[PDB]
Amino acid sequence: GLISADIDTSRAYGQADGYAAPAPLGLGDYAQPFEVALGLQTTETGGALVIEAKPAAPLAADVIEADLVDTPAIYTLTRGALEDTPAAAIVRFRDGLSDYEITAARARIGAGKEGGSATADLALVLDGDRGNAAAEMVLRAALTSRESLSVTLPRSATTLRPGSLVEVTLGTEARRLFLVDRVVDGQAREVTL
Amino acid sequence: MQFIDVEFPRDIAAGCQAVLTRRDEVVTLASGREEVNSRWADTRRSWDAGLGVRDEADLAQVVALFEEVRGRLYAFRFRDWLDWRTAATRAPITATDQPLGLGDGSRTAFQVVKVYGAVNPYTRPLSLPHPGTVRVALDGVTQPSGWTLTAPGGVITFDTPPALGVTVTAGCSFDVPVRFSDPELAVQWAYFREGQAGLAQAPSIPLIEVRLDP
Amino acid sequence: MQFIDVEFPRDIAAGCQAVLTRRDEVVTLASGREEVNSRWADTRRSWDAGLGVRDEADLAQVVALFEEVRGRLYAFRFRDWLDWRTAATRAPITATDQPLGLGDGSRTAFQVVKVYGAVNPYTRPLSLPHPGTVRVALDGVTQPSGWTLTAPGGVITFDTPPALGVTVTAGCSFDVPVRFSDPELAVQWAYFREGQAGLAQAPSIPLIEVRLDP
Amino acid sequence: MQFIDVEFPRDIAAGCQAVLTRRDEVVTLASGREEVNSRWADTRRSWDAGLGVRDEADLAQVVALFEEVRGRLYAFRFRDWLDWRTAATRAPITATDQPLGLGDGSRTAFQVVKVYGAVNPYTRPLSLPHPGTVRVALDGVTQPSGWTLTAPGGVITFDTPPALGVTVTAGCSFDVPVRFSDPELAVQWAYFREGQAGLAQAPSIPLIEVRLDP
Amino acid sequence: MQFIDVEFPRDIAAGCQAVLTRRDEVVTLASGREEVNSRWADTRRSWDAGLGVRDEADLAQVVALFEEVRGRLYAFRFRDWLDWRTAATRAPITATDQPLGLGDGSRTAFQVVKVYGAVNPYTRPLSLPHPGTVRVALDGVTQPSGWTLTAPGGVITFDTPPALGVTVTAGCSFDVPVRFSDPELAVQWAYFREGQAGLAQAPSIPLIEVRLDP
Amino acid sequence: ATVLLAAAGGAIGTSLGGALFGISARLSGGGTIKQTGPRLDSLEVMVSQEGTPLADISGRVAVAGTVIWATKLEEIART
Amino acid sequence: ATVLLAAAGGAIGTSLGGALFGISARLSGGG
Amino acid sequence: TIKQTGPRLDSLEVMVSQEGTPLADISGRVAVAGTVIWATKLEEIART
Amino acid sequence: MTDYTDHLATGCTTLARCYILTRRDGVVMGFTDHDRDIDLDGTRCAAGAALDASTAARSLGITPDDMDAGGALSADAITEADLRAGRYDGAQVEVWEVNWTDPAVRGRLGVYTIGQVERGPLAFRAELRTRPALWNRPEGRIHTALCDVDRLGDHRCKLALGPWQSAATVIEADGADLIVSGLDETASNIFDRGVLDWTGGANAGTGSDIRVARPVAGGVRVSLWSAPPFPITAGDTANATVGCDRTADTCRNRFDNLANFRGFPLM
Amino acid sequence: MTDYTDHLATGCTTLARCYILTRRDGVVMGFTDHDRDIDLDGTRCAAGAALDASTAARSLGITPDDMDAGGALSADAITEADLRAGRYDGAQVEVWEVNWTDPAVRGRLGVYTIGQVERGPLAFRAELRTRPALWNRPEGRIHTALCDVDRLGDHRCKLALGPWQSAATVIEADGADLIVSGLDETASNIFDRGVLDWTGGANAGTGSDIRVARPVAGGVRVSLWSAPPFPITAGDTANATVGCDRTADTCRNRFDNLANFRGFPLM
Amino acid sequence: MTDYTDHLATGCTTLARCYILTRRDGVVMGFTDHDRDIDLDGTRCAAGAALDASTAARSLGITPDDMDAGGALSADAITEADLRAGRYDGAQVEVWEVNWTDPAVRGRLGVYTIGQVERGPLAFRAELRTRPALWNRPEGRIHTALCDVDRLGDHRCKLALGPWQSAATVIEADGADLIVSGLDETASNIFDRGVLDWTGGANAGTGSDIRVARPVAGGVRVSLWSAPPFPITAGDTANATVGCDRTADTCRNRFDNLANFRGFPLM
After folding, report:
1. Cβ of K127 and G7 within 8 Å?
2. How far apart are CA B62 and CA B57, in angstroms?
3. Which of D34, D47, D48, D211 is the mutation pick for testing C, counting most C CBs within 10 A?
4. Which residues are CB-neighbours of C145 under 8 A, at least 6 positions away?
């Protein structure tokens, strides 16, 4: 029952062999399995739904820490524990080639960095080629995700939107690819990177 | 709004203390770049009064005025000596002293405005012009009549709009709407009876000049 | 209710504070927007007593009196010097001084009402008219007998209701009801005996004029 | 209970200050209707002492008394000059001055009570009546004996109960149980040695007259 | 940015206070461990003004001036007595007194720089050289024409860049940029008219020397 | 001076209210909201009841489905 | 010493105790 | 003290065709139905 | 909002964000934050009693944003009775950031819909939930034995409707059980489980469900499931709407839309 | 208390509510709130320190409410050793509200049961849970395997009782392992899983379960499941009870109550 | 710490506990609490902005205590770039309580591992979790169709390895897609899904997984799954590691370790 609001899926990508929705709930929930498998993030700006695919690099905004002097702690790093990475991430996904039946594909973590193992089920029917590729991608992306930063943005810069991509200089170090997670847009905006 | 017209006696006003509050600031980063954000309603005047009430009977009259307002129904008139004269306080206030503006041939109405400054004067519209101190001068000559002052409005309307390139100069005493900050009223009377007195000044009463929201 | 009438000594009252208490403000947005909330039935007064005690024996008497009510049981009778005179401290109160109202031919009962302010006056009914200062007047002549004054009520009832066109004017001293704000009382008495002292100003006795719900 | 009997010297009591605290209030709505709810234990006196200790040796004696109590074991006796006389302080205290009550022919025991105020007197039972100031008068004549005073009790028991319609009048000095508010004792001693001193007044020591809870 | 240059009267400045604001400390663990955080570009100066107003008319002028900027729009020109003299309060400032730098044969532009301290001096570029106190000097001779002074910039540009080996020395009065710390202004004016008073000092007008971001 | 309320129940209310109506994976860390897919059509069974909402598939999937309106039975010869 | 007891464990405990022994449909609202 | 509620575990065990499930790896004497592994197709001697 | 960004960069910025609010009824209130009312694009936004709380909740919809905007209740702008009525409920407010310095630059900070409404004696609190939150409510698309035709004349239903529906005027105001006139005995019991949209009065076509339609003297007494929103005066026009039990048999008896029957009865 | 409501209207009310408490022992402590002790309705309420804490938690049983009254420990009113014993635990307290102004009108504000007790060196705090909370505990009515002869003498169980029960005295006190006398060697191992109610002493017929009964010299040594509450003196009077294993065969051998065996040996 | 207890008992105790920290690299930092540097057991612990410990959480492993020993970051002791690298991550810090009064008495208060680490511009915040927490991570021992050999050459795998593995030097630095030289065309695609441990540079044998190993001009362009930790300069030595998809076919083709496949694919 969406009211025909424009949904822009240009960033969004991916193919589903098949999907079934026994109960149609919220559209975001319906698309939530799609979001993990294809790799997408759903956001809405000004009544238009921008599905910015995860790592689709829709746009990266470059900002300088030295320039941002709103708060003393602009260099706070929200670094992750990095203590919980699955060595094995078996994914139970229906395989279209294998008679449209659920099968398990284990994503393999790179090298030796692991913190226990977690396995994720998938509703989406995916091909064997897709299988063990998407699952593997998620593990790698997450390690990068664990490294993170917190910064404060001026009111003058209204460019950043939550879910956008950024390339913020650390001042001490060169710009690190970042993803805006939440901005308290207003006079003072705190950005989660 | 029409409001409630109750004058604040100049004598009670005598001895009072005032403060000025501006609402525009909201600065930016520590880079040295500061951005001024303005939400309007700036430069309001806050007044602490009740001074110079002399004997308690006179204080009772002010108290009666407070009772008449009943928690400031609408707005309450206050006379400001500082703004009363368009010119300096010793200097005479004249139509020439304050220049309202220039007519375009259609400008029947001119607001009485106090321009606070030179380069970028902050204008204070006068809601209530004290009557009889109003002098209107057209560029050609002082205007005896035809300017219709709306006392609640603060707007003088020429029946015949001043022609293009005609300066309008008007000077008048300033009566300003004030709404009391606090419902409670502090009272200093010092007693009478055998120990006859009447405290000369009641304690500060917070009354705030308020630019009414339109 | 029936309440209690217990006199507060005038000498102790001589040493007493007076502060006007008024409510009904609760304004709205500070954009210059004002909304008048109405608490209703306000205009109470605030007092601090004990400065009139003079000596230890008198101080004991007030303390005993506070004990009598055991913490403001019901009402307490307080002499208010300010409201005692319907006219002025230097001018005698008269029936004519305060206007009760006009009889309509059916208006048997008139509460003593103190009108404060003029254009929008607030009228205060008086619970206890001080005895012997109560005088009734009619437009034709000062009115004597046939008016039944309910001393607790503050209502004067003409046995034959005054016809339309006669103004009822009554002025009387005000024995206002009071309820102590705080149960705790500070005692400054100065030890007597060999010292033979005693204190004229016991501090921190707080009372609030109370408009009793009837 | 029996408690601990330790007298507070009146000389040490000299110069001390006190406050009176009442526990009955618990008022209702702002309609003007207020309900008084009483939980009892009202009108307790709080005393700040340590004054009039003269030289340090005298101060040491009070300090020794504080040590004897050891954090106020049980209760500590304090003599109050204000309550010592049933009558006014200059006036002599007599059996006649305080009327205990009327015998019914079975009323052997009469509590010594200080009635405060007249219309609704708050009664202060006297736990300890100072000995030898106790005078008992039967309606017919002053009673030399047969009234058995219980010093801890504060009750005088007639061996033969006073007959119906017989007034009993008894006047005596008042000794009141007091428990110190604070375990710590503030000390002003003034150094002696070559610059000989001894502080006449030590800082206030909080000791509270306590109505013991049964 | 372009900013605004609005003069602050020197007489008002005479009343104004001076304080030094410095940053960049944030040390490490207090085990005797110290780390120097660098905020960067600090050394602002704190001031409180309005104490030099002297009379009501002048007080009005500064108030109108504050209104002109409507809350510190952009920059405000402040006369600083301390920075006005490159040399001493009793010693005349000279071009030679302050050393701008040395021309390298390509160095057309030199900002006026105030060097404070010796071994590790901090140099402050001056946004506004006071007009007419600006003198340019070269090692060979005091330099006259051909230097283009950007008054807003504080930069002096030689049309022909000074060759290597000639020292550029310039000393000028400092018209420092200021931004008011607080929008609120406290008005101490003393009622005039019949009172005929006026006030020498107005409190609570804080300003901060502002290092404007270019 | 009375009994509980704030001591436990009031405490429950204060703590609960912020949590109940506030702002709306271990490997992920961010915990961005995504719904891990269920087994879905795997082991689909022919549930006799048709009351359950239909699958409404949006893509190619194999569904056992729900029996709807089976036409009673044809009892030609049971024994 | 050691750290975080108050920051995490204490924080849960303080919130938890009131909830644990405290007073006992979307359409319903009242719940 | 932190505890895990007791699971049904071995009781009512059934052989499972799917290989996603991990093996029991028992360290004591338990009876396990297990999961069918590597069935050699089927021998269809007579289909009907 | 690009120029607005420039205004902030210059520092010459005065905030005039106008919280234009469109209620369920469709009435619009400008409600500008700026203390001087600004007509932006011909829309005056009220300076008076405009809810502030500008930042509130500001995600991009990953988190549905309910912008909490407690505001002084202005009787003129907002009516408590209407809030109780629910005209104010489901009010979509588009928050456009505007600058007093420049009316031309209007950038919508966010599109919000009041979802949670709270009231106080003189002030009110509103949670401006984003469109995703409303969209995220789960419908479930249930398919089952009863006709899912539900409201007749819907696109799925393709109901002819027409003749059975009738219009009547209330004869007696009885709250939920108001007696109405102009309805035939045959019409009664066909409007059972139906709606009675009131053309007359504030409802203006808003109808409480008719729990029971029973013929009585002086027209049909209509027992609504609930008391009508707003006090409904006698003589207010109402359009009675045929009510279907939506049972496959009931659907068949009343209309027999076999082609559009949404009742799958057997299993 | 109807008059008390009238007193509330007058405002001339002084609260004299007395927190009468009946424990498992049934001893009653008035613990009146009023500082002067008041005897109400035939119950003397001493002015023991009243239990007053924070704010009233009142729901009419929709939510069970535990009232956390905090009472300064009074030695006469409460004993820590008894609290440890639990004689105090399970206490039921009825709060009866009375007026000092009027002794006659007494009404029970609420009936509550003390549940959770927290002790301090000199003070204690207790939770007065409502009766629904205790009722809310779930028995579950499980039926499987072992016979429900269970505790002997249960009315449903309908045990013969009679001869098996015995009377004994304690030869020695060893806490859990106390040696007892007056018990036959035959009685031992038949009293296994039994109870040993101690008529003598504080227990007064309260008995710890005998985990094991083994005959030893000097009389049977009884090993209780738990150490007895309170120190038990040697020679205290005791009652010895049989223990039912509840195994169907055991139930049959010992009593053979086929009529009342909730046993399902073969399934 | 027995003598340390004695030191506390005497009251002659000065705390010199040294937070010896061994990182994943194995470099050791003294980090002593005592301001004066103490050479306990040879190792010198300097205060070095020692991480501060304030609120003691001690549970004997029932609860792993992750002490938030966030102290002012010491640049000399700890490097942010290394933290980003993760060399500092998984640092095992053994907190040994020592006394300045006596160096000889050293008792480990606890053994801890930094797990959750956060940074500030001039400060750091780190959680030193106890060893049970890492041990408690759940592996699950999953058994499934693909070879569970995983990384080749493990004791379980018993992989021959050897000849297929090769060593290469980077020719171009392209971050994740760096082109390398010294690898044969046959070697390419055998290193697909492999690792590229970098002998050269800070990595010192740490290798990003090779997502793709496609042969190109000037040697094989190696597309790593992720950008290498630390900036890898061209010409850095690297050891290419064969990557096995672990598909039964892949396992068979590359090595055919039927004896140790750990794969159960055909059912």
Report:
1. no
2. 9
3. D34
4. none
Which one, of K53, K57, K52, K55, lies nearest residue K71 by Cα? K52
Name the closest residue on chain B to residue E204, using Cα atoms: B19
Residue D135 φ/ψ, nearest 5 degrees: -125, 130
F68 touches chain I (CB under 8 A): yes
- Please list the residues that pair with J179 across neighbouring strands: J221
Residue numbers in E near B14 (CB within 8 A): 191, 194-195
* Residue B202 identity (one-letter amino acid): A
D141: which strand partners? none
Nearest by CB to residue F2, choosing from J52, J66, J127, is J52
User: Closest Cα to residue C111, out of C101, C119, C121, C103?
Assistant: C101
> Tokens in use for I49?
């009693």
Cβ–Cβ gap A156/I58 under 8 Å: no
Q: Which helix (H) or strand (E) holds I5?
A: helix I2-10
G24: CB partners within 8 A, 6+ apart: J63, J64, J133
The 3-state secondary structure of chain E reads CCCCCCCCCHHHHHHCCCEEECCCCCCCCCCCCCCCCCCCCCCEEEEECCCCCCCHHHHHHHHHHHHHHCCCCCCEEEECHHHHCCCCCCCCCCCCCCEEEEECCCCCEEECEEEECCCCCEEEECCCECCCCCEEECCCCEECCCEEEECCCCEEEECCCCCCCEEEEEECCEEEEEEECCCCEEECCCCCCCCCCCCCCCCCCEEEECCCCC
- In DSSP terms, E157 is beta-bridged to E109, E148
User: In Å, how far is J47's CA from the nearest CA of chain C?
Assistant: 21
Query: Identity (one letter) of the amino acid at E57?
Result: A
Which structural technique was applied? cryo-EM
Q: Which chains touch I (3 or more CB pairs under 8 A)?
A: A, B, C, E, F
Q: How far is CA C64 from CA B54, C69, C209, D21, D39, in A?
A: 38, 9, 20, 13, 20
J14: which chain D residues are within 8 Å (Cβ-Cβ)? 24, 36-40
Give the residue from D200, D138, D203 showing the smallest Cα distance to D169: D138
Contact K20, K28 (CB under 8 A): yes
Distance CA B128, CA J14 (A): 58
A22/F32 CB distance under 8 A:
no
The residue type at I263: G
Distance of alpha carbon F41 from alpha carbon F38, whole angstroms = 9
Q: Is the dihedral of CA E125, E131, E133, E134 positive or negative?
A: positive
CA dist A176 → A142, A143, A167, K117, K122 (Å): 15, 14, 5, 18, 19
* Strands A165-169 and A60-64, sheet pairing: parallel
Question: In Å, what is the CA distance from A58 to each residue of A9, A53, A61, A167, I107?
Answer: 11, 8, 10, 12, 21
Chains that touch J (3 or more CB pairs under 8 A): C, D, F, G
What span, in angstroms and rounded, lies between the C-alpha atoms of D134 and D156?
Answer: 10
- Breaks in chain E (C–N beyond 2.5 Å) sit after none
For residue J2, give the 3-state DSSP assignment.
helix
Q: Single out the residue of I11, J29, A44 nearest to residue B28, CA to CA.
A: I11
Query: Locate tokens 């009750």: which residue?
Result: D155
Amino acid at the residue C36: V
Chain G residues whose beta carbon lies within 8 Å of the beta carbon of residue K55: 1-7, 10
Q: CA-CA distance, E179 to B101, in Å (whole number)?
A: 32
Q: Output the CA torsion sign for G8, G13, G18, G24.
A: positive
Nearest to B176 by CA among B108, B79, B94: B79
Which tokens belong to J162? 């009679």
Q: Is any Cβ of chain H less than 8 angstroms from the Cβ of K142?
A: yes
CB contact under 8 A, E211 and B32: yes
Which H or E run contains J108? Answer: strand J106-119
